[PDB]
Scaffold this motif. Structure first.
Motif, PDB file in Angstrom:
ATOM      1  N   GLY A 268       0.776  -1.291  -0.186  1.00  0.00           N
ATOM      2  CA  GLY A 268      -0.088  -0.017   0.100  1.00  0.00           C
ATOM      3  C   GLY A 268       0.905   1.341   0.125  1.00  0.00           C
ATOM      4  N   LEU A 269       1.915   1.223  -0.339  1.00  0.00           N
ATOM      5  CA  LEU A 269       3.027   2.415  -0.264  1.00  0.00           C
ATOM      6  C   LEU A 269       2.975   3.257  -1.454  1.00  0.00           C
ATOM      7  CD1 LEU A 269       5.845   1.013   2.120  1.00  0.00           C
ATOM      8  CD2 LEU A 269       3.623   1.875   2.796  1.00  0.00           C
ATOM      9  N   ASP A 271       1.456   4.903  -3.715  1.00  0.00           N
ATOM     10  CA  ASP A 271       0.343   6.154  -3.760  1.00  0.00           C
ATOM     11  C   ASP A 271       1.217   7.147  -3.076  1.00  0.00           C
ATOM     12  OD1 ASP A 271      -0.788   4.863  -1.691  1.00  0.00           O
ATOM     13  OD2 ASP A 271      -1.936   6.635  -1.621  1.00  0.00           O
ATOM     14  N   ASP A 272       1.785   6.888  -1.848  1.00  0.00           N
ATOM     15  CA  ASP A 272       2.390   7.647  -0.942  1.00  0.00           C
ATOM     16  C   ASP A 272       3.860   8.010  -1.323  1.00  0.00           C
ATOM     17  OD1 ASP A 272       0.279   7.875   1.332  1.00  0.00           O
ATOM     18  OD2 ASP A 272       0.543   5.626   0.880  1.00  0.00           O
TER      19      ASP A 272
END
Ligand code: CA
Ligand code: CA
Lengths: 318, 313
Positions: A268-269, A271-272
């Motif tokens: 999930g990293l 996009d950041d």
């Protein structure tokens, strides 16, 4: 009436050793003159980079073992892969990219400043190895190297700047030399900062900040020298170079997005990390004298990450 | 693999410099500092990085008292000798050591030569640091003018550059050992002669830090020379040995002529030449060859050797 009535003439009568070779082994060779520096910025940068010398032994990475052991095998694999991919980019810059800047220098002092840059990027690469020696098993290390050679989204980024270093356009080579420290590794640096903002691997992030202290200067200095040359060129040539900078940056951004999505796909990293990467794309443009086109939303960094990025890198001495 | 070979990815990939050399072909691998193909590379990396130094650490201002006891002629000799050494270091930092990067046998060797280039740049910068403290602007400028206009100096500076630029990696490697291994010793004799006489002790501390690096650069280039030459046919090994001796004797002749001109008014040349030829023998030995030079050709006075290893004037 009145009485009618040039230092360092030798300099105009001579050539640096590189220039001697470039001219077909012709000319009288001059030694570097560190007492009469043509551009004071070179002396400032020499002093900064040499006073910032460090080796990974400065950081007690073994104190990260407690938090490392709380990470799952999948997180440990992600970290080893991410860092081995950063080691690849540093290997390129230390052995190809910064070396290639030496003969394109405006001054004798700049020629040797780029030898410092190349060596210090080699130290950056060696530091990841020190981290791996402390934290990782031999199997984790080898699997990450295998993954590096076989991951096409990573290889495409590694391939992207090399033609500019080997081809005969010194300005495009200089742009590449700024883009490497100024942009291409930040999507990976996101990971240690994400972890250290959550109390994991804090000492590793101290290594990252020592690396960044160097990368910032490498980006700044290459951008300074880019501007020094470009400012003397015709308006057409200046506009052509601006277009090239934006074209190459956008192409790198697209390759970076594809790589980070794959690298971080289970976590999930991406996009950041992409926003963190694009924030640094904007800084890269500013160091070459251009305005950033990126929006606040495209460049948003959460406060806890920005704290890790921005913290100062400062009895063991060198 | 039948034998469970480790690190097979290495054979399936190329270093970045090889990817460039092969026309942009191959999967690129990162350096692996956890699997060092030749352990000597790790030893050398560790020693050269532990040996980092900068000239500002040495308080050369404390040499002012003894510098002032030297005549203008001696001060000119020192400034000229050191500016000539700065030229050779400039060549090695910006041309010679960087040229060794693409001729490396291992990934670790590639970056070791970036350290060598940077540290030689520090050597060159050190002479300027000494001059900033001791010399007038006129002394500095006159030495630069003398460097560009002294043909015996220029001929030595011109001797090795074609090997770094041309496409024979072993000849380039010989030159990379010869520069730290031979060409600067005729110059280094002077500060040690002065320090044996109580002159410029802090400057001689800088010279010893430079030497500590040069000794490793010569050793390592000679080690890598021997690694490649040992794999050649006996006839190609013989051709290479003849090249080494021929180039060395050529450089010895250029050096003797230079030192005779440099020291002519001071009576130092014969001792400095023996000092130079002593290290010429150590250069040959670092490449795996026997020194043909006699004890009398290589005689260093005990006062000089003590400086090395730390009525007339
Ligand atoms: Ca997310
Ligand atoms: Ca004599």
């Amino acid at each position: 009436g009145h009485m009618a009535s040039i230092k360092n003439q030798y300099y105009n009568e001579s050539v640096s050793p590189i220039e001697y070779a470039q001219q077909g082994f012709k000319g009288k060779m001059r030694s570097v003159n560190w007492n009469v520096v043509n551009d004071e910025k070179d002396l400032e940068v020499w002093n900064r980079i040499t006073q910032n010398f460090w080796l990974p032994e400065k950081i007690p990475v073994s104190n990260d073992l407690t938090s490392w052991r709380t990470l799952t095998p999948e997180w440990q694999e992600l970290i080893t892969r991410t860092f081995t991919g950063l080691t690849l980019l540093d290997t390129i810059q230390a052995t190809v990219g910064d070396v290639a800047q030496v003969p394109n220098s405006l001054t004798d002092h700049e020629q040797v400043i780029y030898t410092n840059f190349a060596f210090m990027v080699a130290v950056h690469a060696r530091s990841y190895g020190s981290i791996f020696s402390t934290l990782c098993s031999s199997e984790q290390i080898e699997e990450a190297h295998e993954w590096v050679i076989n991951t096409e989204t990573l290889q495409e980024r590694a391939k992207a700047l090399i033609p500019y270093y080997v081809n005969d356009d010194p300005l495009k080579s200089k742009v590449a030399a700024a883009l490497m420290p100024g942009f291409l590794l930040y999507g990976g640096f996101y990971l240690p900062f994400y972890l250290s903002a959550r109390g994991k691997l804090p000492n590793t992030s101290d290594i990252i900040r020592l690396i960044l202290r160097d990368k910032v200067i490498h980006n700044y200095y290459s951008g300074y020298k880019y501007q020094k040359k470009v400012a003397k060129l015709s308006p057409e040539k200046q506009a052509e170079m601006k277009e090239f900078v934006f074209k190459l940056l956008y192409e790198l951004i697209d390759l970076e997005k594809a790589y980070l999505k794959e690298l971080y796909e289970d976590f999930g990293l991406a996009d950041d990390a992409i926003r963190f990467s694009v924030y640094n794309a904007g800084k890269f443009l500013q160091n070459l004298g251009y305005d950033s086109p990126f929006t606040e939303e495209e460049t948003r960094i959460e406060p806890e990450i920005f704290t890790q990025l921005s913290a100062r890198a400062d009895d063991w001495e060198f």
